[PDB]
Symmetry: C2
Subunit: 267 residues, 2 copies
C-alpha cells in the first residue's frame, strides 16, 4: 500500500512484539529457562567460559535470541501479513469458516490474498534461505498439483514466498515445482519469490516495500527505548536463574559441579 500506511501499521505490530520480548525478562519467566545438564561441559569449553555465571549468561543469550527468531516469525506470519497487507492466515479457526480449506491438502498453505481486481493467490510463507533438496521439492510439487486439480476455482495461483535472503543458489531446485524427474508441470501457476521480490509481490508492485517494513520496525524500536535499560534487566534475569542453582552447584571458586547440576535438574 502507501509507504506511510505500511510503515505505521508495521510499526504498530512491531511495537507490540517488542513489549512481549521485554516481558520475558521477569523473575517468574526465569523459572521457565531450561538447562540441559548433559551439554553443559561441552558449551563451557566450546565457548571458553570461565565460570557458572558465564555459562548461565551464555544459555540465557541463546534463550532470548532464539525467542526473538520464533516471535518475529509469528509477527510476520500472524500479524504483519494479515493486518498490514491482505495475506490472511490459515489457522484452524479461520480454515473452518472460509470454504473447504479445512481439507489436509491445504496444509502447506499459510495465507490467502484476494487482490482488488478479483485474483486470489495462495501463499506458502517460508523464512530465510530455506534450501530444500530434490526429495522435499518433489513432494511439494505433488502437493501444489493436488490443490490446483481438485479445487481450481478457489485460487488463480500458488506462491512460495521467502521473506528474506535470496534464491541465488537455489534456482535449480525451485526450477521444477521444470525439466525432469517425478513432478507434474505447473510452471505458470507456481512461482518462488524471495527477499525484495516477495515483499514487492505481497504489496503488488511496490519494490521499496521491504524498506518500509524495516523502517516501521526501526520506528517501534526507537520508541520502545530499551538500549539503556535492558543491560540491567538481562543481568537481573541471570541472577534469578543462577540463584536457583548456586547454593548446591557452585564450588567456592565459582565453577560448577556438573553432576550436582545434573542431579538437581534430573530429580
Amino acid at each position: 500500500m502507501n509507504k506511510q500506511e505500511v510503515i505505521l501499521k508495521v510499526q504498530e505490530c512491531a511495537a507490540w512484539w517488542i513489549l512481549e520480548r521485554q516481558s520475558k525478562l521477569t523473575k517468574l519467566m526465569s523459572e521457565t529457562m531450561s538447562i540441559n545438564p548433559f551439554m553443559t561441559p561441552f558449551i563451557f569449553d566450546y565457548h571458553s567460559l570461565n565460570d557458572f555465571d558465564e555459562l548461565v549468561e551464555a544459555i540465557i543469550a541463546k534463550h532470548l535470541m532464539t525467542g526473538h527468531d520464533t516471535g518475529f516469525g509469528k509477527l510476520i506470519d500472524e500479524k504483519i501479513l494479515p493486518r498490514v497487507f491482505g495475506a490472511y492466515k490459515l489457522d484452524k479457526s479461520y480454515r473452518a469458516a472460509n470454504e473447504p480449506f479445512i481439507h489436509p491438502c491445504f496444509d502447506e498453505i499459510d495465507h490467502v490474498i484476494q487482490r482488488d481486481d478479483g485474483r486470489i493467490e495462495l501463499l506458502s510463507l517460508k523464512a530465510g534461505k530455506w534450501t530444500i533438496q530434490l526429495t522435499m521439492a518433489v513432494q511439494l510439487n505433488k502437493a501444489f498439483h493436488e490443490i490446483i486439480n481438485n479445487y481450481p476455482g478457489v485460487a488463480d495461483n500458488i506462491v512460495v514466498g521467502v521473506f528474506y535472503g535470496n534464491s541465488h543458489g537455489l534456482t535449480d531446485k525451485y526450477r521444477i515445482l521444470g525439466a525432469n524427474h517425478n513432478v507434474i508441470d505447473i510452471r505458470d501457476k507456481v512461482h518462488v519469490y524471495a527477499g525484495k521480490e516477495f515483499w514487492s509481490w505481497l504489496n503488488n508492485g511496490e519494490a521499496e516495500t521491504q524498506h518500509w517494513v524495516l523502517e516501521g520496525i526501526e520506528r517501534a524500536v526507537k520508541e520502545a527505548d530499551i538500549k539503556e535499560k535492558n543491560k540491567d534487566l538481562i543481568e537481573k534475569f541471570k541472577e534469578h536463574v543462577a540463584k536457583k542453582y548456586n547454593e548446591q552447584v557452585l564450588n567456592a571458586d565459582g565453577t560448577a559441579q556438573w553432576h550436582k547440576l545434573l542431579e538437581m535438574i534430573n530429580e
Copy 2:
C-alpha cells in the same frame, strides 16, 4: 550396562559430535550463517550492542549455540540410545499411528518397550494428555506382540509439579471423568534419573555415566583455547562479507544497505 561400557561408548559417540560441531567454525561455513535483516535494529538495542561487529558476534553465538542443541538432540536420538543402550530409532512391523513413538527396545528376555523421547521439562496441557492417552490406548489395543509397554522418556528435567497430568495420560478418571482409558499398567512417564535408569535396566547411576562419557570426550578434544580464536575469526569472516557496504565510520551499520544486500 556396566559403568565403563556406558562411559566408553558414550564418549566415543560424543567425539563424533564434538567433531561435527567443530566443523561449523570455518570460513566456508560462515556463508551458511543466516541474518534476518529486519530483526537487526531490534537485536542491536535489546542486547545493548555498540557496533556491527558486536551484532554479528551475537548472532553467531546464537547460531552455534542452537546448532549444539540440534546436534545433541540427534546424538541422543540416533547414536547414544541405539548404539549404547540398544533402543533403536524408528527410522525405516510398523507404519500406522506410531508417529509419537520414537524408539523400540528388546530386553534380555523378550519384552518390547515403545519409547516416545522428550527433551525439556515437558509440561503438557490437560488436552494433549487426554489426546495422547487416546493414541496410546489405540496402539496397545491392537498388536500386543511388540508392545508390552509404552514409555514417555524425558531424558532431562524432572516431573515435579506436572505429574497430575502424567497420571491422566496413564488413567486416573476422578469425578472430572476425563475422556481417558486405564492403561496405567502398560504406559509410564520416566523423566531425568528414572529415564536413564529405566533405559539401562535398573542402573540408577546411568545418567552420571552418560555425563562422564561426555565430559571425557570434551576433555580429550581439547577445544577450550583453540576455539576462542576460531570463533573470533568466524565473526571477521562473516563481517567482511558486509563491512564495506554497511559500515559507518563509528563502526555501526546502515541497516537498509544490509537489507537490500541480503534480499537482492
